[PDB]
Every structure is written in structure tokens, then in C-alpha cells.
Design an enzyme around this catalytic site. Structure first.
Site, PDB file in Angstrom:
ATOM      1  CB  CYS B 127      -0.938   0.011   1.206  1.00  0.00           C
ATOM      2  SG  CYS B 127      -0.113  -0.392   2.744  1.00  0.00           S
ATOM      3  CG  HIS B 251      -0.832   3.995   4.732  1.00  0.00           C
ATOM      4  ND1 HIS B 251      -0.334   2.858   4.127  1.00  0.00           N
ATOM      5  CD2 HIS B 251      -1.418   3.582   5.873  1.00  0.00           C
ATOM      6  CE1 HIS B 251      -0.588   1.809   4.892  1.00  0.00           C
ATOM      7  NE2 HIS B 251      -1.243   2.223   5.956  1.00  0.00           N
TER       8      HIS B 251
HETATM    9  N1  LIG Z   1      -1.201  -4.386  -0.562  1.00  0.00           N
HETATM   10  C1  LIG Z   1      -1.045  -4.136   0.735  1.00  0.00           C
HETATM   11  O1  LIG Z   1      -0.287  -3.272   1.138  1.00  0.00           O
HETATM   12  C2  LIG Z   1      -1.781  -4.935   1.766  1.00  0.00           C
HETATM   13  C3  LIG Z   1      -2.436  -4.273   2.798  1.00  0.00           C
HETATM   14  C4  LIG Z   1      -3.094  -5.024   3.757  1.00  0.00           C
HETATM   15  C5  LIG Z   1      -3.074  -6.413   3.656  1.00  0.00           C
HETATM   16  N2  LIG Z   1      -2.437  -7.045   2.647  1.00  0.00           N
HETATM   17  C6  LIG Z   1      -2.419  -8.516   2.565  1.00  0.00           C
HETATM   18  O2  LIG Z   1      -3.671  -9.084   2.943  1.00  0.00           O
HETATM   19  C7  LIG Z   1      -3.501  -9.938   4.088  1.00  0.00           C
HETATM   20  C8  LIG Z   1      -4.690  -9.858   5.030  1.00  0.00           C
HETATM   21  O3  LIG Z   1      -4.832  -8.501   5.431  1.00  0.00           O
HETATM   22  P1  LIG Z   1      -6.087  -8.016   6.285  1.00  0.00           P
HETATM   23  O4  LIG Z   1      -5.759  -6.604   6.721  1.00  0.00           O
HETATM   24  O5  LIG Z   1      -7.347  -8.232   5.505  1.00  0.00           O
HETATM   25  O6  LIG Z   1      -6.023  -9.036   7.539  1.00  0.00           O
HETATM   26  P2  LIG Z   1      -7.239  -9.489   8.520  1.00  0.00           P
HETATM   27  O7  LIG Z   1      -8.197  -8.344   8.703  1.00  0.00           O
HETATM   28  O8  LIG Z   1      -6.533 -10.095   9.706  1.00  0.00           O
HETATM   29  O9  LIG Z   1      -7.911 -10.697   7.711  1.00  0.00           O
HETATM   30  C9  LIG Z   1      -7.233 -11.924   7.522  1.00  0.00           C
HETATM   31  C10 LIG Z   1      -7.944 -12.707   6.428  1.00  0.00           C
HETATM   32  O10 LIG Z   1      -7.140 -13.847   6.099  1.00  0.00           O
HETATM   33  C11 LIG Z   1      -7.930 -15.015   6.269  1.00  0.00           C
HETATM   34  N3  LIG Z   1      -7.188 -16.218   6.684  1.00  0.00           N
HETATM   35  C12 LIG Z   1      -6.501 -16.391   7.833  1.00  0.00           C
HETATM   36  N4  LIG Z   1      -5.990 -17.646   7.883  1.00  0.00           N
HETATM   37  C13 LIG Z   1      -6.353 -18.282   6.753  1.00  0.00           C
HETATM   38  C14 LIG Z   1      -6.164 -19.626   6.165  1.00  0.00           C
HETATM   39  N5  LIG Z   1      -5.440 -20.564   6.810  1.00  0.00           N
HETATM   40  N6  LIG Z   1      -6.729 -19.881   4.968  1.00  0.00           N
HETATM   41  C15 LIG Z   1      -7.453 -18.956   4.314  1.00  0.00           C
HETATM   42  N7  LIG Z   1      -7.664 -17.716   4.786  1.00  0.00           N
HETATM   43  C16 LIG Z   1      -7.155 -17.334   5.976  1.00  0.00           C
HETATM   44  C17 LIG Z   1      -8.951 -14.648   7.335  1.00  0.00           C
HETATM   45  O11 LIG Z   1     -10.046 -15.562   7.358  1.00  0.00           O
HETATM   46  P3  LIG Z   1     -10.810 -15.983   8.728  1.00  0.00           P
HETATM   47  O12 LIG Z   1     -11.734 -14.821   9.004  1.00  0.00           O
HETATM   48  O13 LIG Z   1     -11.514 -17.253   8.355  1.00  0.00           O
HETATM   49  O14 LIG Z   1      -9.683 -16.162   9.721  1.00  0.00           O
HETATM   50  C18 LIG Z   1      -9.296 -13.249   6.880  1.00  0.00           C
HETATM   51  O15 LIG Z   1     -10.213 -13.314   5.785  1.00  0.00           O
HETATM   52  C19 LIG Z   1      -2.210  -9.482   4.745  1.00  0.00           C
HETATM   53  O16 LIG Z   1      -1.597 -10.508   5.528  1.00  0.00           O
HETATM   54  C20 LIG Z   1      -1.392  -9.067   3.545  1.00  0.00           C
HETATM   55  O17 LIG Z   1      -0.723 -10.211   2.998  1.00  0.00           O
HETATM   56  C21 LIG Z   1      -1.788  -6.326   1.715  1.00  0.00           C
HETATM   57  O1  LIG Z   2       3.364  -6.469   2.057  1.00  0.00           O
HETATM   58  C1  LIG Z   2       2.163  -6.336   2.364  1.00  0.00           C
HETATM   59  O2  LIG Z   2       1.350  -5.839   1.569  1.00  0.00           O
HETATM   60  C2  LIG Z   2       1.680  -6.769   3.717  1.00  0.00           C
HETATM   61  C3  LIG Z   2       0.981  -5.871   4.511  1.00  0.00           C
HETATM   62  C4  LIG Z   2       0.529  -6.254   5.777  1.00  0.00           C
HETATM   63  C5  LIG Z   2       0.758  -7.541   6.263  1.00  0.00           C
HETATM   64  C6  LIG Z   2       1.452  -8.476   5.501  1.00  0.00           C
HETATM   65  C7  LIG Z   2       1.932  -8.135   4.241  1.00  0.00           C
HETATM   66  C8  LIG Z   2       2.662  -9.149   3.413  1.00  0.00           C
HETATM   67  O3  LIG Z   2       2.034  -9.662   2.472  1.00  0.00           O
HETATM   68  O4  LIG Z   2       3.851  -9.452   3.666  1.00  0.00           O
END
Ligand SMILES: NC(=O)c1ccc[n+]([C@@H]2O[C@H](COP(=O)([O-])OP(=O)(O)OC[C@H]3O[C@@H](n4cnc5c(N)ncnc54)[C@H](OP(=O)(O)O)[C@@H]3O)[C@@H](O)[C@H]2O)c1
Ligand SMILES: O=C(O)c1ccccc1C(=O)O
Ligand SMILES: NC(=O)c1ccc[n+]([C@@H]2O[C@H](COP(=O)([O-])OP(=O)(O)OC[C@H]3O[C@@H](n4cnc5c(N)ncnc54)[C@H](OP(=O)(O)O)[C@@H]3O)[C@@H](O)[C@H]2O)c1
Ligand code: NA
Ligand code: NA
Ligand code: NA
Lengths: 347, 360
Positions: B127, B251
């Protein structure tokens, strides 16, 4: 001992001036609390004693040895000359006299020597500048400073008691009443003396003080100009971005420098650790770094995240945190007063 | 139309992915919501329809045309390659595949052309990186970029639903119960995967993600490496400091650049204004500049405080704000999907180029 006056005793900085004076090594025979007409007649503590707040006037400074001014530039402009005339030594926390060539601008660890040249007024620098100077002077001494680029993360107490209370009310409205941050009513921040006011709750406001003609704010230009004066070197290039964030006390700064000679990082760390007023807090293997919440109430300036730039040979990044009302204001001022006493300059 | 799967539909990013898809120009015939076995069997809305949440597995992607992954790097590592072997085109929000040379790392306004070379996985950047690329690409196009120094001011929503709730709870304990910030108990921030946890309420935490061996964090090094890949120029020097602050969403970034050629500052403002996805908000005489609280809910990236360095002839400072869950994540991913659709790139890949990690 001395007769000491606190001008602006009822404010955010004033309250901490009282605390720092109560804990000071300055010998104080008499303490006087000055503020505006609407605070006159009220009472405030000095240790266990009740002190009547007095109105600040042109004739209120008779019998005062040292006057600490923290009541806004307007108050200093008007009354500090009368104090000096009457034989008072003035330590001024406002920006009014900072760039006057006959006024020392002092951080005692860095340029206490400049106190020797005072003609009745000593200026305390801007809070964000002071903590940066404590962190960087030890590096300048050994390897020089070519340039500084800084982005600040400034607490609201720097904008006064009203700003602290506006911030708390805004946060409660969002969290307790469900008000959207963009719908919040604001009266003070970013700048009391500017036309438009914006919410600080859950926000980051890239404006401290009002804007100048070059599109940097006065706060940003204060960091530039005060750095040059304090370090007595107009060749140090300094550019700043100053941002208000939802922290009540303690300013944080992301600081980038380029030195004149390559400074090995472990030696930089040791030089900062060795410098009085600077505390090295830097062990990323155990997630040790300076934090605003841990710095509140301490007079020290805390430095960490020290690391070389990934590309620029002489570039270094760090994270600097200090209580903006202590080292950033009231403690620097009282420390100046102690230094004046210790060096026989209260005359 | 397409069958679209959202992996991690129940989380912070997932909720916004759903919203962005509901508002998308993608012709969607069928929606599937995937998460953990815990969520499987429960239900969530797509528009007015109830959608039964499914377990994410190697066989959950049969019939899916496009899958948007936002369920953690481990989940992408494990399951995205199976989706690709099922013939799915994967848009991955995680860091896992971003530096794989077979994977385009895309911000559509900047490097949509890279999508043409995909092998079944397209990575969405971090992000913090995305908003910075939207702000700087128009400058790079005309005057080049020599270096970038950035300090970030990052919202807690980027760390997930738990981090949001922890932040709200901590603030309420201080503001309503009179707990001192340093006495707060924390369990998630600054990083769920690290050993020590610190309060965010009334604090600024100079740690996002875990530390790497060079004393920069993973978040800081992502900004460095992702910039070089997206702009297709390894000579751009990039060094970052990434800080979490008590903001729920959006951000902000204090961005310093030095261009290759002197860029007149009013032309820089015009170039940014002219660039799709970037909005110039810059009129300091009227205190106009980007603010996190005003950017929440918008897909645009907002840029202001644009001004020359006081000393460096080619240096420029600016302030960049965007909703970290929209352009920073869900909107950039959905926009990638729309771009794939529009350019006829939604089709199975011929050869598998990604390691299968669950053959056991
Ligand atoms: N592009 C970016 O900068 C950016 C920003 C934010 C996040 N992300 C990515 O998105 C991910 C999640 O972010 P978030 O903020 O949405 O986190 P979050 O609010 O903690 O949500 C986690 C999600 O992952 C699912 N999950 C957890 N364990 C799992 C498994 N074993 N199999 C399948 N699904 C599972 C959860 O499902 P349950 O509800 O069933 O546990 C929930 O849907 C991050 O770890 C990161 O890799 C990227
Ligand atoms: O890099 C990201 O977008 C990120 C952001 C928040 C948690 C985990 C990750 C991850 O995928 O490593
Ligand atoms: N007694 C009253 O009627 C009353 C009621 C409410 C608030 N107050 C005070 O007003 C202040 C409001 O805080 P803030 O956010 O505006 O500022 P602040 O930065 O926290 O403090 C400003 C300080 O400057 C003083 N001051 C301002 N103008 C002055 C003048 N012309 N001469 C001498 N001193 C001057 C104030 O005294 P003053 O305290 O006299 O303003 C105060 O001590 C608080 O210090 C509060 O104690 C007084
Ligand atoms: Na220089
Ligand atoms: Na534009
Ligand atoms: Na087409």
C-alpha cells in the site's frame, strides 16, 4: 537566592516550567506567577505553597532576577524589553527574539558558550529543533554535517492547553458517539492564528504554524534557521516537513543527514550514547527504539533506528524522540537558567 | 461474465474487495468467498445475495476465472500456484510473489503494459508503495528520478481487523478509563509476527513488519525493491522509514525526491494534476493539502505540500495521502482485474512457473 518569575504560568509550558523549577538546582528565594488579566487573582502551587497569579504589566518585573517567558511572542515583544530595562535576565521560549543577532539561541549541551554574550535576553529554540540538535551535535563534532532532511511527528501539547483538550474531545466524539473524523468540529488546530481549522483525531496534519512565502511553514523554516544559528554554520543545508499527529506529548522525528566524512554506524551510535542529554535506545533484534509514550516525563532525548542510507555513502537515517514540553521547552529553559547561575551570568 | 473468487473475504482488505467488486465494471456471473475453515459455512453479502463462505484449499478454484488473494503471504504461497494450475488468473495482494521475475508487479496507471507478460499471477504492491508510485510516476516520466527518501505515517487498518480493534480499545481505555498509555496491554502492534508488542494509542511506532538483516524493516525494504521493479529502474536509490501512527485508515507520506533534470515546481504540480489516479490538492494560501481523514473512501491518491528543497537544485518535497485499503490494496487489485479484462488477458496460462508447496 533568586527571585524568579514565570510569565505564562497557567499554560501548558508554564505548568511544566513550575515542575522543572520545583525540581531545579537553582536557589529560589521567591517565586512569582504571571499571566493575563483573566488569570489574575487565582492560585497555583509552588511545592506546598499557594502562589497568587499576577497580571503581566510593564511595571510587574521590579525585584525579579530571572524571568522565564512562555506566554506567546506578543507577550514577549511587549513586556520583555521592560523586564530587561529593569535589570531582569529573560529566558524567552517564544520565537520573537530567536533571530536577533544580539540574542543567544541556546541548547546548553551544544552551545552554552553563547550565553557569555547575552545582553539581558536568552532565547530557547523551537521544541522540534532542540531535540534534533541534541541528537546531531555529537555527529557534527566528529564527522561534520553537510545536510539535514527531517520529517516530524509532533504532539498536540506543543500547540497549548486548548489544543490538548480539543484533541481529547475530538477522539471521544469519534470513539464514543460514532462521529466520522471528517465531520468533527475544530477551533484551534492546525494553527490557532490561521483562518481554517481541521480535526486532528485519526489524522495527520502537514501544517504547524502558518505558511511563509516559500510554501514552507514557519515551523519548518524555524528548524532550518535555528539549526544554522545554534550550530553556528550557515552552510548546513536544512529542509523540513512538520506534521501534527494524534499524540498528546512527545515529538518524534525521522532524521536524515549527510556527513562530511564517512561515519561508521557503530561509532555514530557510540558518539550519540556519549553525548550528555542524548540516550541511545537502539537494539532492533529486541525491537528497542525510542517511543513517544515512554519518553514523556523524561528530560533526555532518545535516539535509535540508526542506520546508513542504502545508497548515499555519507547518508545516515535515525529516529529521535523527546518530551516536547520538557527538553523541547520548559526543561531547556530551566537548564539555561541553571547554566546562567552556574557560570555567574545572572547579572 | 466471470466467476470471481475473493480469498480472505472476511478480513479488513476482504471487506473492501467486496465493496470494490460490487462497484466494479467487471462482468461478474458468479462470486465465491474463500477464507479459513473457521469461516467456512458462514455467510456474507454480495449486493443483496447471500454467499456461503468456503474453505481455501487446492481444489476450491475449479471454474474460477479470477481470484483476488488477500489472506496472508503464507496462504498465497500455498494456494495461488494451485489456482494457476486450475487455469485461474490470480491477483495477489501479499508480498510473496512480488519479486518473482515471472510475476508483473503492477499499478495500472504506471505499468499496465507489464500485465501482457503474466504467467497466471499478477502481484499488487504494498500500500505504501502504490500511492508513492502514483504521485511520482508523472515526475519520473518528464524529469527522471535519481533518488527517493520517504518517511511514512501509516494507519492501523493496514495491519488487519485485530489491529483496528486493538487501537480502538486502547484509545477507549485511555480516554474513558484513565489508563496511562505506557500501562496499556498490546497483543498485535507493531507486528503480529514479532515477539514484543507495544501500544499505538498516543504513540508513533517506528516499526512496520519485522526487521531484516540490514536494520531496515521488511516494510521499508519493500518500498525500496518494489519501486525499482515497478519503475523498471534499479538505479533509483530508495531509502525509507516506516512509522505506524494512531490513524484508522489512510496512509500519509513525506516524500523527498531528486530528479535527473531540474523540474520547474509549478510544472511538477501540473504533471501530477494531469496524471490519472492522482489529484493535486495544493493551495497553501488557503490551507489546502491532503489529509488522511478526507481521503478515506476515495480511490484517488492526493498530493500536496509540493515545494523545492531549500538547497538541492533537483530536490523536491511533497505530501502524499491515499486510503490504504482502497488504492493501497482492494481498489488496486480490482483495477488490475478490470485492466486484465479490458486487455483480453483473462485466460489460462500454458506452463506452470510457480512452485507447488503442498504436494505432501
Ligand atoms: N497491498 C497491501 O499493502 C496490503 C495491505 C493489507 C493487507 N495485505 C495482505 O492481505 C492480508 C490480510 O490482510 P487483512 O488486513 O485483511 O487481515 P485481517 O483483517 O486479519 O484478515 C485476515 C484474512 O485472512 C484469512 N485467513 C486467515 N488464515 C487463513 C487460512 N489458513 N486460509 C485462508 N484464509 C485465511 C482470514 O479468514 P478468517 O476470518 O476465516 O480467519 C481473513 O479473511 C495481509 O496478511 C497481507 O498479505 C496487503
Ligand atoms: O506487504 C504487504 O502488503 C503486507 C501488509 C501487511 C501484512 C502483511 C503483508 C505481506 O504480504 O507481507
Ligand atoms: N482565569 C481565566 O479566566 C481562564 C479561564 C480559562 C482559561 N484560562 C487560561 O488560558 C490559557 C488557555 O490556553 P492556550 O491553549 O490559549 O495557551 P497555552 O499556550 O497553553 O498558554 C498560554 C499562556 O500565555 C498566557 N498569556 C496569553 N496572553 C497573555 C498576555 N497578554 N499577557 C500575559 N500572559 C498571557 C496565558 O495566560 P492566561 O491563563 O491568563 O490566559 C497562558 O499562561 C490556559 O493557560 C488557561 O489556564 C484562564
Ligand atoms: Na552543506
Ligand atoms: Na490527475
Ligand atoms: Na479489449
Amino acid at each position: 537566592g533568586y527571585t524568579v518569575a514565570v510569565v505564562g504560568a497557567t499554560g501548558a509550558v508554564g505548568a511544566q516550567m513550575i515542575k522543572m523549577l520545583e525540581e531545579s538546582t537553582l536557589p529560589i528565594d521567591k517565586i512569582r506567577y504571571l499571566a493575563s488579566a483573566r488569570s489574575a487573582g487565582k492560585s497555583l502551587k509552588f511545592k506546598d505553597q499557594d502562589i497568587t497569579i499576577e497580571e503581566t504589566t510593564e511595571t510587574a518585573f521590579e525585584g525579579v532576577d530571572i524571568a522565564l517567558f512562555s506566554a506567546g511572542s506578543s507577550t514577549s515583544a511587549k513586556y520583555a524589553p521592560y523586564a530587561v530595562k529593569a535589570g531582569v535576565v529573560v529566558v524567552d521560549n517564544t520565537s520573537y527574539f530567536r533571530q536577533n543577532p544580539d540574542v543567544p539561541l541556546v541548547v546548553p549541551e551544544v552551545n552554552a558558550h553563547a550565553l557569555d554574550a547575552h545582553n539581558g535576553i536568552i532565547a530557547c529554540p523551537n521544541c522540534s529543533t532542540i531535540q534534533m540538535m541534541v541528537a546531531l551535535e555529537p555527529v557534527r563534532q566528529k564527522w561534520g554535517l553537510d545536510r539535514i532532511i527531517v520529517s516530524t511527528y509532533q504532539a498536540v501539547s506543543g500547540a497549548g492547553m486548548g489544543a490538548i483538550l480539543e484533541t481529547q474531545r475530538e477522539l471521544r466524539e469519534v470513539l464514543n458517539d460514532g462521529v466520522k473524523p471528517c465531520d468533527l468540529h475544530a477551533e484551534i488546530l492546525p494553527s490557532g492564528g490561521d483562518k481554517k481549522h481541521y480535526p486532528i483525531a485519526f489524522n495527520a496534519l502537514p501544517q504547524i504554524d502558518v505558511f511563509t512565502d516559500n510554501d514552507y511553514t514557519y515551523e519548518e523554516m524555524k528548524m532550518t534557521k535555528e539549526t544554522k544559528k545554534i550550530m553556528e554554520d550557515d552552510s548546513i543545508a536544512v529542509s523540513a516537513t512538520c506534521v501534527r499527529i494524534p499524540v498528546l506529548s512527545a515529538h518524534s522525528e525521522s532524521v536524515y543527514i549527510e556527513t562530511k566524512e564517512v561515519a561508521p554506524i557503530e561509532e555514530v551510535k557510540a558518539a550519540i550514547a556519549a553525548f550528555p542529554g542524548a540516550v541511545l535506545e537502539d537494539d532492533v533484534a529486541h525491537q528497542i527504539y525510542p517511543q513517544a509514550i515512554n519518553a514523556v516525563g523524561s528530560r533526555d532525548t532518545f535516539v535509535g533506528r540508526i542506520r546508513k542510507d542504502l545508497d548515499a555513502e555519507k547518508g545516515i537515517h535515525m529516529w529521535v524522540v523527546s518530551d516536547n514540553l520538557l527538553k523541547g521547552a520548559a526543561w531547556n529553559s530551566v537548564q539555561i537558567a541553571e547554566t546562567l547561575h552556574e557560570r555567574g551570568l545572572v547579572r
